[PDB]
Design a protein around this nucleic acid. Sequence first.
RNA 1: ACAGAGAAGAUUAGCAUGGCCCCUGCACAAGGAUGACACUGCGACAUUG
Length: 335
Amino acid sequence: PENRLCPMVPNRATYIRYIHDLLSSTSGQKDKKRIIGLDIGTGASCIYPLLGCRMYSYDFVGTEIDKFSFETAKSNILQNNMESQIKIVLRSKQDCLLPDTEGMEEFTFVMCNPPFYEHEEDFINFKQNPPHEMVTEGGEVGFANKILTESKKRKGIQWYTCMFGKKSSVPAVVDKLREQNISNYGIYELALGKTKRWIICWSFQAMRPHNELIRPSSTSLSKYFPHKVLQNWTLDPELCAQIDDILQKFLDDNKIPWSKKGSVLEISTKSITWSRKARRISKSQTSVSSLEGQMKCELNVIDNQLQCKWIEGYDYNVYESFCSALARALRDNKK
RNA sequence: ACAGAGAAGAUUAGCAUGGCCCCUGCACAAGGAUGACACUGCGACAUUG
Ligand SMILES: C[S@@+](CC[C@H](N)C(=O)[O-])C[C@H]1O[C@@H](n2cnc3c(N)ncnc32)[C@H](O)[C@@H]1O
C-alpha cells in the first residue's frame, strides 16, 4: 500500500521457487524437518512468508523497520491464519538485521530485498514518480554489506540470499564475497519482460545446488560466475552399451568409494584417489597419506550422455580433477 | 506509477595466460603430449541495440 499497492509481480513467486529448489537440491539424507525462514524487509505486504507458507509449508520471521509496516504485517498474518507459523518483529534503524532465535531452531534460510536508493535528490533525479522505506546509506550494496557482515556470526543458517536490482551491484557484492572467501554462492538471472534481477545467494555449508541455479546461461557476467557443478559428456553407441562396465572399472580401479542408488550412481570421497599425486603419494613414503577435500557427486546416464553433478564439498579442485579423470576414462574406451 | 540499458563498449572468429586429467620424475620445480575446462589478459574480424 505505502510502496507496492500491486500484486502483479510474479517475481515473488519465482523467488520462493528458487528458495525451494535451493533447499530441495541441497537437503540430502536430512529429514523433512520444520523449516523456518527469515524475511529481512517483510514490508506491509509480507508476500515472502505468505507464499513460502502457502506453497511449501515453511515457517517465517519478518523483521521490519517501520511501525506502519509492522502493524500491517501483523494484520495480514492475522487474517491469514499463519499466526502459529509466521512471526513479525519491529526493530529500530540501528538493530542488527538478524534477530535472535529466541529458543527455537536456527533459520534454514535468510532472504531479503534491500532498499535501493541513497538520497531524495537522487530519488527525484532518477525517478520520483508520485508514490525510511526506500532509503539506506549505500543502497542495495550497503544493505548487502551489512547482511554479509552479520552473516559471519550466524553460520547455522544454511542459505543466505539477497536480491539485486542493478547489474553494477553484482560486481561489488560478488567482489566482497570473494574477499571473504565464500566459495559456495550463486547468481540466478530472472526475466520479466525487459527487467532482470540477480539473486546472489551464499552459504557457509557444503551442499552445492544445481548449475541452473548458480550459473546463469548468459556469459555477460562470466567473470562473476561461481564454480561449475555439472560437466556433461555426449556418448556414442559402443559407449552407450559399455557405459556400466566402464564406470565400474573406473570407480573400482582407482580406490574410489561408491554405491548405487537405484537409477543414479553415487560416490563418497574423503580424499582424491584418482589424481596422479594420489598414486605417487601412496607409492612414496610420506607422512601425509591422503589428499584432503571431500566430495559427493552422482554419475547418471541419460540418452547417450553422462553427467557428473556435484552435491557436496568446499573445494572445487576435487570436482575438477574427478571430471577430467572421467573424461579421459571415456576417451580411452570410446576408441 | 518508483530498482538494467539508460553504457561502458561489448560478444564472438582467434592468439596468448592459468589451472585439470595423462605420461616422465622423490620432492619441488622442470618438460612433452593431448583434450575436457576458466573468477586471467590483447582483439587479424563480423554485426548490432
Ligand atoms: C524494497 S523494501 C522490501 C519490501 C519487500 N519487497 C516486501 O515484501 O514488501 C526494503 C525493505 O528494507 C527494510 N529495511 C531497511 N532497513 C532496515 C533495517 N535497519 N532493519 C530492518 N528492515 C530494514 C524495510 O523494512 C523495507 O521493507
